[PDB]
Amino acid sequence: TQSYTNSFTRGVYYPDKVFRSSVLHSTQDLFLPFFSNVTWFHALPFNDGVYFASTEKSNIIRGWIFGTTLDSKTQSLLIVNNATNVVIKVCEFQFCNDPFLMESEFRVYSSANNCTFEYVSQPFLMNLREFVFKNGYFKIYSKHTPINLERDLPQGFSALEPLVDLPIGINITRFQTLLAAAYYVGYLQPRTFLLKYNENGTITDAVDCALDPLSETKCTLKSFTVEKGIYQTSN
Amino acid sequence: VKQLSSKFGAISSVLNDILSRLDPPEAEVQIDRLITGRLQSLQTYVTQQL
Amino acid sequence: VKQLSSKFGAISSVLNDILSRLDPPEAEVQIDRLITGRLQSLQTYVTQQL
Amino acid sequence: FRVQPTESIVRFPNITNLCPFHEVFNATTFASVYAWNRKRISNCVADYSVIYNFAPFFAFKCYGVSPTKLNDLCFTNVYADSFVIRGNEVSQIAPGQTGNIADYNYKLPDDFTGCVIAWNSNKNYLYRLLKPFERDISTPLQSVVVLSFELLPATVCGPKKSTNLVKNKCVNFNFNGLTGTGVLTESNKKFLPFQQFGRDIADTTDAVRDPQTLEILDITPCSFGGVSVITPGTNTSNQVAVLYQGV
């Protein structure tokens, strides 16, 4: 099925790898907007990058697959979240209409061709798990913050720390989720933010400079509070 | 207003006659001259207004 | 203080980057651009201070 | 008044496996203009100071980097192309020249492309009649090595000898690409393991990770100030007093 819901000013990651003190640094990168019509699912386009968020009790849904046309066109991506490690396979794969992935199966589409990458490291999980896939390399962000909510996506701010930096140069147009689940997919857009760092150096607050005139005059002068008056913001 | 029709060492005075006729990375040495001249004119105007 | 991070059309905003990968035949143009920009910032600061 | 440094140290990582570049041009044959190669190895130590003469490298036209200063630079992104072109017209391969190649084959977006070497070869290219770095493979017909860099963490460094770590004095350092002077102090922790540099409101480097022991090292240059001379008058006396300011 498919349903519509609203974000709660979340989906903000770290742009660079530079330590900053309690300063108000304004960046400009492909960010998810604060209040957007996100889609809940129970051949998605990639656009500028997706925001994957899925809550699961005992890690049922796992895996990803990326590609343009599959078969023999611009290779494919295969992320498998095994219980001991994470296997990344970048080869040419055919078919793969449905995943339908001892008791379970250990095959999706097979038909391997050559080899480009094999990145085996520590596993991601071990709910409210968020993943940002931004493509020219391949950035993967993650954050595991347990919460107590019925439909998830709660109030507050959670900054997503970078985990995986794959140096793969390829275009991706179609996005599909490998393997009764529940996940959300948002779309990234070029926006300008104003990230706030604390004393520990983690992002605790941000504003969007394209939503509201109050949220636009919060960006011209680097201050979260606004005194009473009239301010000239744009033209 | 009248300072917008000066040359400041460039080959023209309007941006569209350089961005559509001259090369993209050889017009950077004349767009910079126009920017420097107009910035100097605006700065001198603000200076006398103060 | 914030004007030291500007490039003014050069390759870098810090002199140590310019004086570590450019040959002394070709390391003076960016230095002159940064010198002109920082000099103009200095006279602007002195004029508004007066 | 200022304090002059008395030592220079280089803090490079312990990896010393050389990149396969001495036999990169000797491996196989350079390709055509139909396809360029861009996937290269950037997990090694580069060495661009091995061969200069009696090698197939004629043109040394470099943009933004000089060939002399190549053993004290750490590189972030390294590419290496290999393709054939007519040696009679090699001037069009430049960030700024628009001709036959800069219509549907190549476009360098005025970036630090390292050095472009065309050389000579006598021993096809299958050119077709464009965005920068946008290859096209489509089927009118008729029968160089560029190291595009990005000096703005680093894993490909130059050949240099790493020395010991010295603190609490004015010493020149070289961790990755910083050639300034300062005093190293172990304080102001809570660096996360993905992040290396440190900055502030004024965007100045106040911290740096050691590539060997992964320890936080603060950067503060030496104390300075002004010198004022208090004179009672030349006609009156001859001796003066010197006031140092802010020290």
Curated annotation (Swiss-Prot), chains B, C:
Subunit of the fusion protein that is processed upon entry into the host cell. Mediates fusion of the virion and cellular membranes by functioning as a class I viral fusion protein. Contains a viral fusion peptide that is unmasked after S2 cleavage. This cleavage can occur at the cell membrane by host TMPRSS2 or during endocytosis by host CSTL. In either case, this triggers an extensive and irreversible conformational change that leads to fusion of the viral envelope with the cellular cytoplasmic membrane, releasing viral genomic RNA into the host cell cytoplasm. Residues 1-31 form a coiled coil. It comes from the Viruses. Changing residue 19 to F: In strain: Omicron/BA.1. This is Spike protein S2'. The gene is S.
